[PDB]
Amino acid sequence: GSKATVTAMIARELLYGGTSPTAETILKNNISGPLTRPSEQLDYLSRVQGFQVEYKDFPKNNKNEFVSLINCSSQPPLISHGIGKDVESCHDMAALNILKLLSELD
Amino acid sequence: GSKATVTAMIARELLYGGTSPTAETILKNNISGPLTRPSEQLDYLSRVQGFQVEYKDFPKNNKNEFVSLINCSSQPPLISHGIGKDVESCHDMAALNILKLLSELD
Ligand SMILES: [Cl-]
Ligand SMILES: [Cl-]
């Protein structure tokens, strides 16, 4: 709305994560991948370190809940999961679990 | 060291800030500005919103401490400060204070 409000929104986004989707929208044009989601973060880590990350999803259940498994290669494989109202949410939850495990948050 | 250790370092950096200087170093070559510091974040915000940010620094004092002021244009100007063992640290502290103020953390 007002741009004191917009200024606060941008500042908060930067303080939280060092990026600002709001500023990006302001600056964006139609003329002319930080990685903010756990799934993206894990894809990047795997690319550098070389392990494979893949997801398996079950169809939406009768309560409209999605469930996914994530596999991150190793011996044995690290397998986690996520649930949620859409598949991408399941993926981010599952990837977050793997990132926390790999971070050795002992 | 070991790359279980390297994997944990990268994962932690991603979880914290959605970037990984460690991964960047691994991937970097000599062949071929998220914004992780408050000073950078504030420079970006000012660029989008249009206000001017500038710093004034005093010379290192007899205890080797630096002190800086930051000015962020408005009426009146927002003026904050930072102290530290080098000028860049002063700048980041001062910029953080301004970001927190602009974020309306009431
Ligand atoms: Cl992905
Ligand atoms: Cl700067």
Side-chain angles (χ1 to χ4, degrees), chain A residues 7 12 18 34-35 49 103-104, chain B residues 7 12 18 34-35 49 103-104:
Chain A
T7 296
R12 286 179 184 198
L35 294 168
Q49 292 297 84
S103 289
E104 296 185 12
Chain B
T7 296
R12 286 179 184 198
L35 294 168
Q49 292 297 84
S103 289
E104 296 185 12

Side-chain angles (χ1 to χ4, degrees), chain B residues 14-62:
Chain B
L14 292 165
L15 281 180
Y16 179 80
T19 67
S20 176
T22 296
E24 279 172 52
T25 295
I26 291 168
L27 297 176
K28 76 159 168 129
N29 82 73
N30 267 322
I31 308 169
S32 237
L35 294 168
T36 68
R37 292 178 165 190
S39 61
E40 297 169 330
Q41 291 164 8
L42 181 57
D43 192 357
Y44 181 65
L45 173 59
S46 86
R47 175 208 157 195
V48 185
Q49 292 297 84
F51 53 82
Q52 284 75 50
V53 174
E54 284 159 41
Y55 301 84
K56 174 171 294 196
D57 317 304
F58 301 105
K60 181 165 81 165
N61 75 16
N62 58 343

Side-chain angles (χ1 to χ4, degrees), chain A residues 32-82:
Chain A
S32 237
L35 294 168
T36 68
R37 292 178 165 190
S39 61
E40 297 169 330
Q41 291 164 8
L42 181 57
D43 192 357
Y44 181 65
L45 173 59
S46 86
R47 175 208 157 195
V48 185
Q49 292 297 84
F51 53 82
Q52 284 75 50
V53 174
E54 284 159 41
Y55 301 84
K56 174 171 294 196
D57 317 304
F58 301 105
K60 181 165 81 165
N61 75 16
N62 58 343
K63 258 82 171 93
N64 294 321
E65 194 75 345
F66 290 88
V67 182
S68 297
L69 297 175
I70 190 177
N71 187 93
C72 177
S73 53
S74 69
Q75 300 184 297
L78 297 185
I79 299 172
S80 192
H81 83 288

